[PDB]
Design a binder for this molecule. Structure first.
Ligand SMILES: Nc1ncnc2c1ncn2[C@@H]1O[C@H](COP(=O)(O)OP(=O)(O)O)[C@@H](O)[C@H]1O
Ligand code: BEF
Ligand SMILES: [Mg+2]
Ligand SMILES: [Mg+2]
Ligand SMILES: [Mg+2]
Ligand SMILES: [Mg+2]
Ligand SMILES: [Mg+2]
Ligand SMILES: [Mg+2]
Length: 438
RNA sequence: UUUUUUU
């Protein structure tokens, strides 16, 4: 029932180009700019329009309450993706930002969202959000909403999370009383738009987080329905650690004259702070191998572990076998009630439960303090998924370890895996090589 | 049963 709106732009009006270089940035010579990017491994796709990178938080002219939250976090320097992404976002250009897992992409798009909103007329009664952020999972949308909440406690900005499995009442109430920032999964937002609980008439700033996942074949049509409701002169910002060829052309259906920035290797790459370990075994030894791994992991104080499996059924079965065998393990997947999913992820965040067993519902975006191990019990569907899964550890500056159970049935992915491992200068299991050569 | 994504 949702039809592509054709906006008549001749009526409304809104503010776009408000970024002004800080004096420490204005005085940067081209040499100094190239050295900044080179040192931070920032690449601006050749021929694109792009401001200079900043190298300090005060360069972005965030409001003071934002800075106070940054100082409460004791964040001392913006990450590479923030150094180049803050100014580009704040300048108003459509963009694609590609940077390794745990590199701070969330703030890279949330804080310019706040400045953006601050240069707009205030919301009136009945107005929809100015900034819309779209994410592939309910937990990820809730996490991003809590970030936006920490940086808006001392301002007039309100945000809300719009996602399924949760009661509609409080979400509808948030929407009708008015929020500047809306974080959403696609289904529940489509539902609310069709029934008129919210609308996208004031939406001028649109973020696709985990953008390559949102453009895959199951999400693309939902993304298209939502984005057909947004004025075509909106600013569009796509973010991910992975940007495979197959999505690139498609992304341009939702972008105008955009700029792409990459941090790190232009090819597919994991975060280099993860120790990557690959075990070649048969399917049938996976159970035994896991137990031995866990017995090692659980002999140390810092033991927080995510275990990834391919299906909801194996998620349940492995979890039950671990807990009957007796381990302190809990699971999260798409057939759990949303109350159970929230309870399990909160227990895992807070250190009450050291072992999470998950499907790919937990593979993207989740930022959980002190995850020290990631275990691919089942190899994932793609190299990209591999990179995101193991990026659940070694966030920000921390280190972490990834163990992968690789079987002859995974053989057609071995090559691509080897390429990720070599790109991260890892010691390659000779058994993996020898499996490929035969 | 890939996995997610409004009852
Ligand atoms: N400038 C910074 N300095 C230190 N830590 C930061 C900075 N920006 C963000 N972080 C922290 O890094 C962690 C991962 O950031 P996040 O946006 O989730 O990464 P990504 O989206 O790039 O995977 C978060 O806990 C976040 O608070
Ligand atoms: F890329 Be981060 F892990 F969302
Ligand atoms: Mg400081
Ligand atoms: Mg954050
Ligand atoms: Mg401002
Ligand atoms: Mg086998
Ligand atoms: Mg993220
Ligand atoms: Mg759905």
């Amino acid at each position: 029932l949702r039809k592509k709106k054709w906006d008549l732009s001749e009526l409304p009006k809104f503010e776009k180009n408000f970024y002004v270089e800080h004096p420490e940035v204005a005085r940067l010579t081209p040499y100094e700019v190239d050295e900044l990017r080179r040192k931070k491994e920032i690449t601006v796709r050749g021929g694109d329009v792009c401001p200079k990178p900043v190298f300090a938080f005060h360069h972005a002219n965030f409001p003071q309450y934002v800075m106070d939250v940054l100082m409460d976090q004791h964040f001392t320097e913006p990450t590479p993706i923030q150094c180049q992404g803050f100014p580009l976002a704040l300048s108003g250009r459509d963009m694609v930002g590609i940077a390794q897992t745990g590199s701070g992409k969330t703030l890279a798009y949330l804080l310019p969202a706040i400045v953006h909103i601050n240069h707009q007329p205030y919301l009136e009664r009945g107005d929809g959000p100015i900034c819309l952020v779209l994410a592939p999972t309910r937990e990820l949308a809730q996490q991003v909403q809590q970030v936006a909440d920490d940086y808006g406690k001392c301002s007039r900005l309100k945000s809300t999370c719009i996602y399924g499995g949760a009661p509609k009442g409080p979400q509808i109430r948030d929407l009708e009383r008015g929020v500047e920032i809306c974080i959403a999964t696609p289904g529940r937002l489509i539902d609310f738009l069709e029934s008129g609980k919210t609308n996208l008439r004031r939406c001028t700033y649109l973020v696709l987080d985990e953008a390559d996942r949102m453009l895959d074949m199951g999400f693309e049509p939902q993304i298209r329905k939502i984005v057909d409701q947004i004025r075509p002169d909106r600013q569009t910002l796509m973010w991910s650690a992975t940007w495979p060829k197959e999505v690139r052309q498609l992304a341009e259906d939702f972008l105008r004259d955009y700029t792409q920035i990459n941090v790190g290797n232009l090819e597919l790459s994991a975060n280099h702070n993860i120790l990557q370990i690959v075990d070649v075994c048969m399917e049938s030894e996976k159970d035994h191998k896991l137990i031995q791994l866990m017995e090692e992991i659980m002999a140390e104080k810092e033991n927080k572990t995510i275990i990834f499996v391919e299906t909801k059924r194996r998620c349940d079965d492995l979890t039950r076998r671990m807990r009957r065998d007796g381990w302190p393990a809990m699971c999260i997947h798409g057939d759990k009630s949303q109350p159970e999913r929230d309870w399990v992820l909160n227990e895992f965040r807070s250190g009450k439960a050291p072992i999470l067993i998950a499907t790919d519902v937990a593979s993207r975006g989740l930022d959980v303090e002190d995850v020290k191990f990631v275990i691919n019990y089942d190899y994932p569907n793609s190299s990209e998924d591999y990179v995101h899964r193991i990026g659940r550890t070694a966030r920000s500056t921390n280190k972490g370890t990834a163990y992968t159970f690789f079987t002859p049935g995974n053989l057609k992915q071995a090559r691509e895996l080897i390429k990720v491992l070599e790109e991260a200068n890892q010691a390659i299991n000779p058994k993996l090589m020898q499996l490929v050569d035969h």
